[PDB]
Amino acid sequence: MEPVIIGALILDVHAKPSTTPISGTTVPGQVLFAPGGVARNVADCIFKLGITPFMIGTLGLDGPANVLLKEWKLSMKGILRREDISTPIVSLVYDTNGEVAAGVAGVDAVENFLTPEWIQRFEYNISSARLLMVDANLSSLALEASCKLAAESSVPVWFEPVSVTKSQRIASIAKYVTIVSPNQDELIAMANALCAKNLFHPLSIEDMFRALKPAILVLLKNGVKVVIVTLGSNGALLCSKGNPKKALVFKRVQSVCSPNRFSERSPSLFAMHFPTIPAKVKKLTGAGDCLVGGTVASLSDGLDLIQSLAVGIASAKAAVESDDNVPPEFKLDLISGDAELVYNGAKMLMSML
Amino acid sequence: MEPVIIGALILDVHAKPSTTPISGTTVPGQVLFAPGGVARNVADCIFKLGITPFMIGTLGLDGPANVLLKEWKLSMKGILRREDISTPIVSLVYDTNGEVAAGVAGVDAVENFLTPEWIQRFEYNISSARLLMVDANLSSLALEASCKLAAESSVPVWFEPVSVTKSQRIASIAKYVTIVSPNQDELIAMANALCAKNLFHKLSIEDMFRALKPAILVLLKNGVKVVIVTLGSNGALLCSKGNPKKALNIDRKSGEVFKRVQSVCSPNRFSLFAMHFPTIPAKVKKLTGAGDCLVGGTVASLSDGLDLIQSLAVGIASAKAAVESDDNVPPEFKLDLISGDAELVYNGAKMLM
Ligand code: NA
Ligand code: NA
């Protein structure tokens, strides 16, 4: 009952300049190819954590596809390859921060060729899936087809907003979505999209949460059960409608991250903050994807959402310390240790909605 | 026999956005890969014109190399490939205007790994070459080793000034160099490098020539035999020590480019000699590769037995084909079109001195 991952397979071009990038000319630095795309990264992360995912995507019969598939050890029956299709490419120019200064995509092969027609071939896989994860690179039509299959079989759906623009695609599928994982810009865009108007616009944790609470409520009322807001270096917010456990390799995590840790019996809005762990950043790209991958893998292994999120945040830290979007391997003892640190450090927010 | 091409093999990455370039995230647009590097471009241009060159360069055993070499149909024995090497890449992110918003270049593989030691492996190739073409991407040591090998065997050397900065690498090898092909910024930079002081720092053709004559003479005084100043849309300037109608001292036993051009570009039409060659009006799609194909077209023509005046005309024709292509080098050359354009340039050529 493998988790099913649907979305983009992208060849990433990462340009980290030695000095500050200046207009009108090139500056010295390093430029690397990295296997990318939210869905590909999530699948890769889940696999390296010891769970086999099923990948549904589309690739070309070109050079970039041959880079992405060189060391691909998962099934490829879910991957649509034809010659008319041009493999998606994202080109990023970083700053010295490790943040993106300028990026271009690059990815309309996904919206045009990862169709409902292709996804419906795998109705059994989605139906029997432990979890369905879709990224917003999919078209509204593909997202509808995907999410309606999982809902039919009562399979929980994870929607990754990918960007501010593409996050608005939550609008037509919100009912079917169980979990979303936006940052604070994407959360705002999603809230605006469901509100049909531009009602929301993009410090301490209780300030940030109080500022995002109206936007979070919008998503919850539109049928989303769990909203995970990634706050980068100040961790993540886990917000859910009802008890977070009721909303939906790792027996180490189950041991040390006790499910009996949190005494709190079913609120309309549940909120708690997860801290992140200090890390030696080489590239922040892929951090969010590994959070999702780490979380899905744990949920797929029978852990609850609170335990799974800690694993996700652990995986995110490992990812920023690599020059890949997803690290070449995961060290389980490191993953478990970091997860416990995050888990034990998780605190609850907020007595009347 | 075969012309030897030594220099950079670069993967060019052009990111031209739909619009709205913003920090912190990817933005919609198109990203293209283009096989680049002056030497690689010259080699490709020469081959498509029906002459086989020998390429000496350095590449990695990575993804960029596999994109770069995918449709490479020439020998690879002159190309140093090792796991230590990361394939040179120039990554450019444009704005709506078409100017570079941010650019990063990682091309230190050429200067660090294309050593004199590697070049001396192909001493037989360089010695027996009809012509030797080196780009300024090479280190000074690599340039010295290559050009002194050619000088011993009296093999003509073509030095291509990659940029204003790298053009100054002519300083230690000017003695060995037969032909240089700078634009006028590069010509000034090379002149200053050769001089004991920095004496050099819209216009009509004989006016622009009269302004460049001192800088041109400097190069001539230092041993350069032929100076070709590329003037973009104002054609090219051909200045030489002695008669301009020079040819490659190679036995007759030719090809299709030779007897097409020779028929149509009569050799009976035509110290220091100076000519101006006009360019041909063209549908510019991208100026990419224009200078390189001017070099490529001229070398190819010289290699098939044409004189310098005939060869330069082909080069400007080839340069035109390159600007009306949007690969650095056009996918193919239509020899009839090249020949027709060459006659236009040839017949439009004017004596200045
Ligand atoms: Na990373
Ligand atoms: Na071009």
UniProtKB/Swiss-Prot annotation, chain A:
Its main location: other. Changing residue 12 to N: Reduces kinase activity 66-fold. Transmembrane segments: none annotated. It is found in: Peroxisome. Mg(2+) binds at residues 181, 230. Pfam families: PfkB. Changing residue 289 to A: Reduces kinase activity 171-fold. ATP binds at residues 230, 232, 235, 276, 284, 288. Keywords: ATP-binding, Kinase, Magnesium, Metal-binding, Nucleotide-binding, Peroxisome, Transferase. It catalyses: pseudouridine + ATP = psi-UMP + ADP + H(+). Changing residue 320 to A: Reduces kinase activity 5-fold. Forms homodimers. This is Pseudouridine kinase. It comes from Arabidopsis thaliana. The gene is PUKI.
